Write an enzyme that holds these catalytic residues in place. Structure first.
Site, PDB file in Angstrom:
ATOM      1  N   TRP A   1       0.847  -1.152   0.116  1.00  0.00           N
ATOM      2  CA  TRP A   1       0.070  -0.013  -0.030  1.00  0.00           C
ATOM      3  C   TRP A   1       0.952   1.254   0.167  1.00  0.00           C
ATOM      4  CZ3 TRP A   1       0.653   3.362   4.125  1.00  0.00           C
ATOM      5  CH2 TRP A   1       1.013   2.617   5.481  1.00  0.00           C
TER       6      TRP A   1
ATOM      7  N   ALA B   1       7.573  -4.742  -4.670  1.00  0.00           N
ATOM      8  CA  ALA B   1       8.287  -5.819  -4.170  1.00  0.00           C
ATOM      9  C   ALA B   1       9.620  -5.794  -4.476  1.00  0.00           C
ATOM     10  CB  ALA B   1       7.630  -6.970  -4.638  1.00  0.00           C
TER      11      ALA B   1
ATOM     12  N   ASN C   1      11.957  -3.623  -4.481  1.00  0.00           N
ATOM     13  CA  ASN C   1      12.739  -2.521  -3.856  1.00  0.00           C
ATOM     14  C   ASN C   1      13.162  -3.418  -2.188  1.00  0.00           C
ATOM     15  OD1 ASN C   1      13.140   0.461  -5.145  1.00  0.00           O
ATOM     16  ND2 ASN C   1      12.094  -1.099  -6.154  1.00  0.00           N
TER      17      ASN C   1
ATOM     18  N   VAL D   1      16.579  -9.807   0.897  1.00  0.00           N
ATOM     19  CA  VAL D   1      17.643 -10.248   1.720  1.00  0.00           C
ATOM     20  C   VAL D   1      18.917 -10.718   1.231  1.00  0.00           C
ATOM     21  CG1 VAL D   1      18.168 -11.998   3.439  1.00  0.00           C
ATOM     22  CG2 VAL D   1      15.923 -10.937   3.556  1.00  0.00           C
TER      23      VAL D   1
ATOM     24  N   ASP E   1      23.422 -10.576   1.743  1.00  0.00           N
ATOM     25  CA  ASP E   1      24.575 -10.426   2.510  1.00  0.00           C
ATOM     26  C   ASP E   1      24.207 -10.298   3.897  1.00  0.00           C
ATOM     27  OD1 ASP E   1      26.309 -10.199  -0.038  1.00  0.00           O
ATOM     28  OD2 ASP E   1      26.217  -8.164  -0.085  1.00  0.00           O
TER      29      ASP E   1
ATOM     30  N   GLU F   1      -1.095   1.517  17.389  1.00  0.00           N
ATOM     31  CA  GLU F   1       0.153   1.519  16.703  1.00  0.00           C
ATOM     32  C   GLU F   1       1.373   2.031  17.860  1.00  0.00           C
ATOM     33  OE1 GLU F   1       0.180   4.184  13.148  1.00  0.00           O
ATOM     34  OE2 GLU F   1       2.224   4.348  13.083  1.00  0.00           O
TER      35      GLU F   1
ATOM     36  N   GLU G   1      11.104   6.406  13.434  1.00  0.00           N
ATOM     37  CA  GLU G   1      10.977   7.124  12.204  1.00  0.00           C
ATOM     38  C   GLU G   1      12.059   7.960  11.801  1.00  0.00           C
ATOM     39  OE1 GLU G   1       7.044   9.216  13.145  1.00  0.00           O
ATOM     40  OE2 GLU G   1       6.245   8.192  11.453  1.00  0.00           O
TER      41      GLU G   1
END
Ligand SMILES: [Mg+2]
Length: 269
Positions: free
Chosen positions: A51, A61, A63, A66, A68, A129, A134
């Protein structure tokens, strides 16, 4: 002396230890919310959730992945005038409830974007949340002088569009003198970022093994939360400013890297 400086602290500066177990309780590992990222992208544990935030974010997807020994999220340049910040998001398939502790080892992308580690269940109108970080070490806005060392942590409790929110920020220049990560900006080295979600309202953040900020939810949390990392930008001074497009071609700064996540449930001994 033959000792080490870290022997003089009860804190684990490497982040490999949870907080002290309360009397009668013990910490046990939640294996579905823990990963060393040494064995690829484990689809039994993690999903790419795509989203979008507002313009210019485009979640993709490709960007994230997994490689190294790290989970990575990379910002690259797209060719849609309104969706040019190609990025990604990884979230747990499992959800967690208090009392629990989660910590992740993160080296941020050095672009004007929030590098995030957060827990959520819900949407704009109804959610619980906890934002552990951030963090933006390279603000473009000329307005966030402490951002390279500032840990931005907060909670949201939203019921029918009524938001309760408080920040519990910390600064890494306020870590103890013995902590080798004191004053090290978010892009310079990996730090560890934790949260002890103690009960329905009490939330204690941790940074490089030390207690950081804390908040108390104005309302009981009632939801079980997914664990999330993402990398995003927007044209807002509170985020630090919009990412510079020129930085997205630089592979030394455009990638958020997560070495590991350790998640624990506090349970009766
Ligand atoms: Mg690793």
């Amino acid at each position: 002396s033959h000792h080490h400086h870290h022997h003089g602290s009860t804190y684990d500066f490497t982040g490999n230890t949870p907080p002290p177990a309360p009397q009668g309780m013990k910490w046990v590992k939640i294996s579905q919310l823990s990963d060393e990222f040494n064995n690829g992208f484990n689809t039994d544990k993690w999903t790419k959730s795509l989203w979008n935030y507002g313009v210019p974010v485009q979640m993709k997807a490709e960007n994230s992945g997994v490689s190294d020994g790290k989970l990575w999220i990379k910002a690259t340049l797209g060719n849609d005038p309104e969706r040019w910040f190609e990025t990604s998001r990884v979230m747990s398939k499992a959800q967690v409830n208090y009392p629990m502790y989660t910590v992740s080892r993160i080296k941020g992308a050095h672009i004007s974007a929030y590098n995030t580690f957060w827990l959520n269940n819900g949407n704009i109108s109804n959610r619980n949340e906890i934002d552990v970080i951030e963090n933006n070490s390279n603000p473009s806005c000329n307005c966030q002088p402490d951002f390279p060392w500032q840990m931005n942590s907060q909670y949201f409790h939203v019921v029918n569009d009524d938001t309760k929110r408080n920040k519990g920020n910390f600064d890494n220049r306020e870590l103890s003198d013995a902590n080798p990560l004191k004053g090290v900006a978010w892009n310079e080295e990996y730090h560890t970022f934790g949260v002890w979600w103690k009960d329905a309202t009490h939330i204690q953040f941790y940074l490089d093994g030390e207690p950081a900020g804390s908040v108390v939810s104005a309302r009981d949390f009632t939801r079980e939360l997914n664990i999330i990392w993402d990398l995003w930008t927007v044209d807002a001074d509170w985020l630090g400013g919009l990412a510079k497009k020129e930085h997205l071609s630089n592979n030394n700064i455009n990638t958020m890297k997560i070495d590991w996540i350790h998640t624990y449930q506090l349970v009766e001994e």
